[PDB]
Write a protein that holds these residues in place. Structure first.
Motif, mmCIF file in Angstrom:
data_model
loop_
_atom_site.group_PDB
_atom_site.id
_atom_site.type_symbol
_atom_site.label_atom_id
_atom_site.label_comp_id
_atom_site.label_asym_id
_atom_site.label_seq_id
_atom_site.Cartn_x
_atom_site.Cartn_y
_atom_site.Cartn_z
ATOM 1 N N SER A 137 0.828 -1.193 0.000
ATOM 2 C CA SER A 137 0.000 0.000 0.000
ATOM 3 C C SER A 137 0.871 1.255 0.000
ATOM 4 O O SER A 137 2.095 1.201 0.152
ATOM 5 C CB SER A 137 -0.936 0.003 1.209
ATOM 6 O OG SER A 137 -0.201 0.017 2.420
ATOM 7 N N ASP A 178 -1.504 9.426 -2.432
ATOM 8 C CA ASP A 178 -2.627 8.545 -2.119
ATOM 9 C C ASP A 178 -2.976 8.593 -0.637
ATOM 10 O O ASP A 178 -4.157 8.538 -0.274
ATOM 11 C CB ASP A 178 -2.312 7.111 -2.541
ATOM 12 C CG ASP A 178 -2.278 6.940 -4.042
ATOM 13 O OD1 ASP A 178 -3.100 7.582 -4.726
ATOM 14 O OD2 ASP A 178 -1.435 6.163 -4.536
ATOM 15 N N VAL A 179 -1.967 8.672 0.235
ATOM 16 C CA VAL A 179 -2.243 8.802 1.667
ATOM 17 C C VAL A 179 -2.986 10.104 1.943
ATOM 18 O O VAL A 179 -3.989 10.135 2.676
ATOM 19 C CB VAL A 179 -0.938 8.721 2.477
ATOM 20 C CG1 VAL A 179 -1.230 8.914 3.960
ATOM 21 C CG2 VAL A 179 -0.239 7.392 2.237
ATOM 22 N N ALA A 182 -6.344 9.660 1.251
ATOM 23 C CA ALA A 182 -7.012 8.929 2.320
ATOM 24 C C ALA A 182 -7.428 9.848 3.458
ATOM 25 O O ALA A 182 -8.362 9.521 4.197
ATOM 26 C CB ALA A 182 -6.110 7.816 2.854
#
Length: 336
Positions: A137, A178-179, A182
């Motif tokens: 991830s 991407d984090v 999130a």
């Protein structure tokens, strides 16, 4: 949040979880401790001035792009510019005490390639590899860079001359993106500068000389990263396709600490060599325009007969390391 550090990690491969999954070397030292991956960068009074050179064994770098102990250097390259081979030369021909490689977002083939290279390296017993394949991830990909930097920091506090490698800042920037997605006073995007300000030379400890690789398109992240770092090395695809290895375009590369880590005669010879390279390029575009005939301009003939020795000085087999004295001797013979 916390990871393994210590000399027991030397010769080991670490995944984003902080555990050892493979080994390219074995050491009689089994020191294993734990340190937080998210540590505060040093205070301004705790840092020292970059004054010692970080010799790389590569002629063009040690002569024209001389790195410093504690410097943060960017390596900008494209698809097939020999970036991995350049990093292999940096690890193999430099003189650092400990090397910490951080493969961020790589593919399995590349990870096993770095492991296979380390299994036959001379610095084999002094390396720690922290990887994060493209399967993990984004959190794991960022935590891989944080883990590698933490290990390098532990080895720095022990007084060792550490060389950290981060490959690459591009894929790490994607994972961080991407984090941040999130999550939607603390921003996830701020983890890139805070990561880049962790290397350096400490007054009370050793040093971390960092090499961050940045991928180029066949980029705003690349420009801001070049604004943060202490210099960059540009690997030209044009030079790579002409057979120039390393494909370092020294006229588009700089070390911001260069004048502080080399003496006066080195400065003079480097300036003369850069001017010789500039004149060689002007002669190259004159030749491409088809307006160069031997005999007319004696200056163009002098510069023409210098292309062979200059190109010979710039090229370097990936298996050969040159001392500083050898590099200055060769570059001195080239600018006569």
């Amino acid at each position: 949040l916390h990871t393994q550090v210590g000399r027991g990690l030397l010769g080991a491969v670490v995944n984003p979880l902080g555990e050892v999954t493979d080994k390219f070397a074995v050491t009689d030292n089994s020191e294993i401790l734990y340190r937080p991956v998210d540590n505060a960068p040093p205070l301004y009074s705790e840092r020292a001035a970059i004054e010692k050179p970080f010799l790389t064994g590569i002629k063009v770098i040690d002569s024209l792009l001389t790195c410093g102990e504690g410097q943060r250097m960017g390596i900008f390259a494209s698809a097939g510019c020999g970036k991995t081979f350049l990093m292999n030369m940096l690890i193999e021909h430099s003189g650092a005490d400990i090397y910490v490689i951080g493969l961020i977002g790589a593919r399995g083939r590349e990870v096993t390639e770095t492991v296979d290279y380390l299994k036959n390296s001379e610095k084999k017993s002094r390396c720690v590899l922290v990887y994060a394949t493209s399967d993990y991830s984004s959190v794991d990909r960022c935590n891989a860079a944080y883990i590698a930097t933490a290990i390098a920091e532990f080895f720095r506090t022990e007084g060792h001359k550490v060389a950290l490698f981060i490959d690459s800042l591009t894929r790490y920037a994607r994972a961080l993106r991407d984090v941040a997605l999130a999550a939607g006073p603390v921003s996830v995007f701020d983890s890139l500068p805070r990561l880049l300000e962790r290397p350096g030379k400490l007054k009370a400890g050793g040093s971390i000389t960092a090499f961050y690789t940045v991928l180029l398109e066949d980029d705003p992240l690349a420009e801001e990263v070049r604004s943060i770092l202490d210099g960059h090395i540009y690997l030209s695809r044009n030079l790579a396709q002409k057979g120039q290895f390393p494909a370092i375009d020294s006229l588009k590369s700089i070390s911001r600490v260069f004048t502080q880590v080399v003496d006066e005669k080195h400065r003079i010879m480097a300036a003369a060599f850069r001017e010789l390279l500039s004149e060689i390029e002007e002669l190259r575009t004159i030749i491409d325009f088809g307006e160069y005939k031997p005999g007319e301009n004696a200056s163009q003939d002098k510069i023409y007969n210098k292309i062979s020795v200059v190109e010979s000085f710039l090229k370097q087999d990936y298996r050969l390391g040159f001392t500083y004295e050898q590099t200055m001797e060769l570059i001195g013979e080239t600018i006569r």
